[PDB]
Write a protein that binds this ligand. Structure first.
Ligand code: ZN
Length: 257
């Protein structure tokens, strides 16, 4: 099945998921000089005060911090979005070394990792229906660089030992995702896709310009996770990122001048 290895990685995905070569695939390189300020964008609204985290799961390709999305508790609105999008989970993509890991790139620069807060459009009722629609998901993407520790990330890092292998989960209640946001909400936006199979072209991407800083020790702990299940030969969970895909007939818009 698909993964990030030599024999099942991103360059193979198109065989099972032909949309991999589609017209609005993600991630992309963000060329900062070509992105155009769009005065029509409305202010972005990240409302996470009532967020209810539940569980953290190693799914074999990342770890997901899952939220109660059975009501409007943690929602993304505004910006390029019409309507209300409910937070369902966040996860990261990261590298084997600090010089790679992000999916989006900025003027071809790769960051050490990239955080994805995944939200679905409530007008479609459930996540499974939303992913079948061109405006079904909104993902807030945030770059991670290595430097000072991110205090609001530490509760995540410290539970990783308990979900080392594929299929393991742990209770993860009362986690506040506001502690993972940078100061500025300046962003780039474009229409794209899931970056993992099934690669559905259902996402409005909102990628923040300002990275957050995490420490070397924090990202080292990401890299101790395993793609494999318990008892199986160890395959460190690293380089679980898809590279930049052709922009094709798309324009990246900036929220800032
Ligand atoms: Zn992702």
């Amino acid at each position: 099945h698909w993964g990030y290895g030599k024999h099942n990685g991103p360059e193979h995905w198109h065989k099972d998921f032909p949309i991999a070569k589609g017209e609005r695939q993600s991630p992309v390189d963000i060329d900062t000089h070509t992105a155009k300020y769009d005065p029509s964008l409305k202010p972005l609204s990240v409302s996470y005060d009532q967020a209810t985290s539940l569980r953290i799961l190693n799914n074999g390709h990342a770890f997901n911090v899952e939220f109660d999305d059975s009501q409007d508790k943690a929602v993304l609105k505004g910006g390029p979005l019409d309507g209300t999008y409910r937070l369902i989970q966040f996860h990261f993509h990261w590298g084997s070394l600090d010089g790679q890991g992000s999916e989006h790139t900025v003027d071809k620069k790769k960051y050490a990792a990239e955080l994805h807060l995944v939200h679905w459009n409530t007008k479609y009722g459930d996540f499974g229906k939303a992913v079948q629609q061109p405006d079904g998901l909104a993902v807030l993407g945030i770059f991670l660089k290595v430097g000072s520790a991110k205090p609001g990330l530490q509760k995540v890092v410290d539970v990783l030992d308990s979900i080392k292998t594929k299929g393991k989960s742990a209770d993860f209640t009362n986690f506040d995702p506001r502690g993972l946001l940078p100061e500025s909400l300046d962003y780039w936006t474009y229409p794209g896709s899931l970056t993992t199979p099934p690669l559905l072209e259902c996402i409005t991407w909102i990628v923040l310009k300002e990275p957050i800083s995490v420490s070397s020790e924090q990202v080292l702990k990401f890299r101790k996770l395993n793609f494999n299940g318990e008892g199986e030969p160890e395959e460190l969970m690293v380089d679980n990122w898809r590279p930049a895909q052709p922009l094709k007939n798309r324009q990246i818009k900036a929220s800032f001048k």
